[PDB]
Structure formats: structure tokens, C-alpha cells
Symmetry: C2
Subunit: 210 residues, 2 copies
């Protein structure tokens, strides 16, 4: 059963309830498990910037705690930039339902960022619900058009092969990265609850536990 | 005088002339130098995939051959994913003129990817011209709104600091990466002409020269 994470940062935390409700409708339909890992817009909660969003997503995805991360920010760009800087994280950006569908078919990565402020007005939750339906409608990497499945899959494969070279490994990153930065990223009660229960990488769990 | 690179891959090479003409109008206005580094849609020319786009952009940006890279593909997502996997490359994705403006103010990275197929129909060159005007209208990183300049700049700074850790360095990447892959990326006559003339990193120039 595919595991999905939702991660909101500071600027858009007050919209988390809406984004979650929209996402949950789509994940429920597919039978996926949804984990609300980031900010919920609750007073006094543990804070996250879009850069910390990338770090959290990298920890979750590389350890297989989740299979897919949904994130974003005001424009979605910042979160997208940060997630893609990490090993094992391929994060698209989508602004309409067709974009979300094409992302799933052409790129078939393990994360997507969406704008939650720019263009986000009346009826925004209708668009979100539709975007999430289209994101999960069909098996990922299936190609658009169906006839271009081979080269699209090939290039997606090569990107991953290149990322193996261009990124440092996760354990190195965690040991080098600023320690307050990392502690703050993983300090949230929900991360603390969900991650250790779902982490499939014993080495990383042990390092983060203290 | 800011140096801009345009890099098109295979799928969108036939649109290069249009994209270049639109870009050149905006760069001319600002007094920037524009270099058409990728595919031009000319028969028998040296080929590039969106992944090779990332490699080329990383070489150009890290050596200071150019200061800014404009790229894209059918949706712009693939190129965005690849460019962001490299050290020293921060590539946004923008679909309308306001997106391009916000990118420049909020993120202030050194690359932008645009869709050249999805949504690209009648009057697409009007939209492109406007997007490029808005991209270069104001000093980058100036903040939107002006009042949020401090935290937006701070997060942009932190992303770069994190990228120092999460990415391998360029020289390592070039020595490790598949050699046919790298040779094919840099085999184009225009790269061969422009890069060595503009490269400010003696070490990289020497490695690529053979």
C-alpha cells in the first residue's frame, strides 16, 4: 500500500487542512496511506522552512518511510529547489491537473511541489482535488504519449543514474549538515511518531534517534 | 555585462528560433549578452537530452562561462529536475510572466526552465517575450513583497549552503560521470566555440579540452 507524505512549510501551514483534505480524498480513493508530516497550521507547532522540507523529504524517501512526498510553498518553487538538491529525491512542480498527470507519466518521480498561494483563491480546493486525482490516476512512468514510453523512461532512468554521482549520500549529508538545522527539522511530534515506525533503514534511524 | 545561455534539448529544438528571438528581445533591452548553447533545430546537429541539459548548465554556470541559464523541454519539468541535481545550479520552473517575476525576486537562482510544448500554442511568442521581460525587469533576489526581502534572501542563502553539502563537486562529477555521456554533451560546435572563450575556471577547461 503506497505511503504518501504531505509536508507544508511556514508560509503555507494555515492551508494545510485544505491541502490535506483534498489530498486525502485522492489517496483514500486509491487505497493509499497518507501521513501529514509537516506543519499543520496549529499554534506553537514545530517550524519548517522550504529548505528543511527538502531535508525531511530526503530522510523520508531514502529510508522508504514513504514512497511519495507532496509538498509546496507560496509558489512551490522554493520547496522544489530544495527537494531536488538531495540524493534519491526527484520533485516536480505542477500548477494544473494536466501538469500533475503529465508529471506522473513522463517523469514518474517520488515528489511533487504545488503552489499554495500564487493562483490559490476561490475554488482552489476543487483544482487541488482534481490535480491529486490526475496525479494518482495511472501507474507512474507509463509515458505520454503511450508511444513515447521508451525514451521517456530511458531519460528518467539516466537522471537517476546521474543523481547517484552528483549527490552526496544521505549518511554523509546528515553527519556534515548543520546540527541545529537537522534537529529542528526532525523535532516535530508527528515526524517523531511516524518516521521511526516506518523507517526501513536501520542505519539512519539509529543516527537520528539521538 | 550579464551573460545568458539558452539551452534547448531534442524534443523542443524546432522551437529554438522562436525562443531565441523572444529571449534576445529581452536580453538586448537589458544590455545582456545572449549565447545560444544548445540545439537550434538544425538538421544533423549534435543532440542533447534534458539530462545532458543539466550537465551542460552545470559546466557553464560553475565555470562562470555564463551567469544565467534559460532552458526547458515539453513541460519544462525534466530539464528542471536535471539542472537542480548539480552543484551550483538553482533552476526554477515558470509558466506565466508573473511566475517569472516572482522567481527572480523570491528565489533569485541562476537558471529557469519553461514549458515549450504544453500550453505552447497560438500567440505563445507573446507570452514568452513577456515572461522574459518580467524575469529580467528587476535586480534578482529583491523580494516579493519588498517587506519579506530578509527571510526570502535568508532561505535562498541557506539553500546554497545546503547545496554545498548535498552535491558532489564538479571536478569529481566530470571524472566519475559516463565518458560518452560527457563527450556527447560538449561535442556541439557552439559549446566548443563559446565555452573555452568564456570559461573562468582553468582546471575545468583543461580537463574538458581533451
Amino acid at each position: 500500500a503506497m505511503k504518501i507524505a504531505l509536508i507544508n512549510e511556514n508560509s503555507q501551514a494555515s492551508k494545510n487542512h485544505i491541502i490535506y483534505d483534498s489530498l486525502k480524498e485522492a489517496t483514500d480513493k486509491k487505497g493509499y496511506q497518507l501521513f501529514n508530516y509537516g506543519m499543520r497550521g496549529e499554534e506553537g507547532e514545530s517550524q519548517l522552512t522550504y529548505v528543511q522540507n527538502g531535508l525531511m523529504a530526503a530522510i523520508l524517501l531514502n529510508t522508504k518511510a514513504v514512497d511519495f512526498v507532496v509538498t509546496g510553498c507560496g509558489t512551490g518553487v522554493g520547496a522544489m529547489l530544495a527537494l531536488n538538491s538531495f540524493p534519491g529525491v526527484v520533485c516536480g512542480l505542477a500548477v494544473d491537473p494536466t501538469d500533475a498527470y503529465l508529471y506522473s507519466q513522463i517523469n514518474g518521480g517520488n515528489a511533487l511541489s504545488i503552489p499554495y498561494a500564487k493562483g490559490f483563491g476561490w475554488g482552489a480546493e476543487l483544482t487541488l482535488k482534481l490535480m491529486f486525482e490526475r496525479l494518482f490516476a495511472e501507474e507512474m512512468g507509463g509515458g505520454y504519449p503511450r508511444e513515447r514510453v521508451i525514451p521517456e523512461q530511458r531519460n528518467a532512468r539516466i537522471l537517476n543514474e546521474v543523481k547517484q554521482i552528483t549527490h552526496n549520500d544521505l549518511m554523509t549529508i546528515l553527519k556534515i549538515i548543520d546540527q541545529d538545522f537537522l534537529k529542528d527539522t526532525i523535532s516535530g511530534k508527528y515526524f517523531q511518531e511516524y518516521f521511526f515506525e516506518n523507517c526501513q533503514d536501520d542505519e539512519v534511524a539509529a543516527y537520528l534517534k539521538e
